[PDB]
């Protein structure tokens, strides 16, 4: 029983099902009243909200599902016809968010690929994408600045393709924002936002020194 069989558990004892609103409603209380898990949050989701609506892509690309609460929260912005594909290399989580998107009604929508976003990107024109209107950037830091990169090479961009980076301040991804800042191929908008809690895995390395080789 992991956290986020529990989080999938909630949502179908207490969301109204096809109802993404109700959802996302459920995610967030499990969240800041059980137990904290790296949903994008509330707060977050507004400003998503607003960059889905304001650019009107047809066709999103995610990295990181997770759970799926930002793969719900941008799904259910979309017009009819528009789809959404979110990269998952955890298969247990992307079990877990095509639940959380038929609880939601939003299946029709969404496909999940799963493995790793470095490994997936240069697939994705056999998988019948040529050019993506958006992406969003919330998987393992390290890998923004490369995947941006990459998805110029496999010309998965076009102008006007608006790039949209989660937690760019805390941890933090200072590489890929110099990167997309310095250069002029790259026009950016910095949306701040206030996190009251924020737990990341991390740790220490006991290394003892056995003698030279
Ligand atoms: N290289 C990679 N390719 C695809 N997924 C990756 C990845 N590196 C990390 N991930 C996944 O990215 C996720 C980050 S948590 C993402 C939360 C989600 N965007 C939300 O707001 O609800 C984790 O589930 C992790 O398994
Ligand atoms: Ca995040």
Same mark, same amino acid.
């Given at each position: 029983?992991?956290?986020?069989?529990?989080?999938?558990?909630?949502?179908?004892?207490?969301?109204?099902?096809?109802?993404?609103?109700?959802?996302?409603?459920?995610?967030?209380?499990?969240?800041?009243?059980?137990?904290?898990?790296?949903?994008?949050?509330?707060?977050?989701?507004?400003?998503?909200?607003?960059?889905?609506?304001?650019?009107?892509?047809?066709?999103?690309?995610?990295?990181?599902?997770?759970?799926?609460?930002?793969?719900?929260?941008?799904?259910?912005?979309?017009?009819?016809?528009?789809?959404?594909?979110?990269?998952?290399?955890?298969? @247990?989580?992307?079990?877990?968010?095509?639940?959380? &998107?038929?609880?939601? =009604? !939003?299946?029709? %929508?969404? *496909?999940? $690929?799963?493995?790793?976003?470095?490994?997936?990107?240069?697939?994705?024109?056999?998988?019948?994408?040529?050019?993506?209107?958006?992406?969003?950037?919330?998987?393992?830091? @390290?890998?923004?600045?490369?995947?941006?990169?990459? &998805?110029?090479?496999? =010309? !998965?961009?076009? %102008?006007? *393709?608006? $790039?949209?980076?989660?937690?760019?301040?805390?941890?933090?991804?200072?590489?890929?924002?110099?990167?997309?800042?310095?250069?002029?191929?790259?026009?950016?908008?910095?949306?701040?936002?206030?996190?009251?809690?924020?737990?990341?895995?991390?740790?220490?390395?006991?290394?003892?020194?056995?003698?030279?080789?």
């Amino acid at each position: 029983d992991t956290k986020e069989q529990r989080i999938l558990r909630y949502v179908q004892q207490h969301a109204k099902p096809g109802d993404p609103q109700s959802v996302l409603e459920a995610i967030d209380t499990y969240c800041t009243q059980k137990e904290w898990a790296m949903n994008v949050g509330d707060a977050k989701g507004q400003i998503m909200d607003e960059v889905i609506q304001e650019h009107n892509p047809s066709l999103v690309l995610e990295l990181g599902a997770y759970c799926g609460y930002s793969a719900v929260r941008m799904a259910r912005l979309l017009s009819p016809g528009a789809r959404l594909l979110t990269m998952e290399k955890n298969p @247990d989580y992307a079990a877990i968010t095509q639940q959380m &998107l038929n609880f939601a =009604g !939003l299946q029709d %929508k969404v *496909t999940i $690929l799963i493995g790793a976003s470095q490994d997936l990107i240069p697939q994705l024109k056999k998988y019948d994408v040529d050019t993506l209107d958006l992406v969003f950037l919330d998987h393992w830091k @390290d890998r923004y600045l490369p995947d941006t990169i990459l &998805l110029e090479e496999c =010309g !998965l961009l076009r %102008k006007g *393709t608006v $790039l949209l980076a989660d937690n760019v301040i805390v941890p933090g991804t200072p590489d890929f924002l110099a990167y997309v800042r310095g250069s002029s191929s790259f026009e950016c908008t910095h949306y701040s936002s206030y996190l009251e809690y924020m737990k990341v895995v991390d740790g220490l390395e006991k290394a003892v020194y056995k003698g030279p080789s």
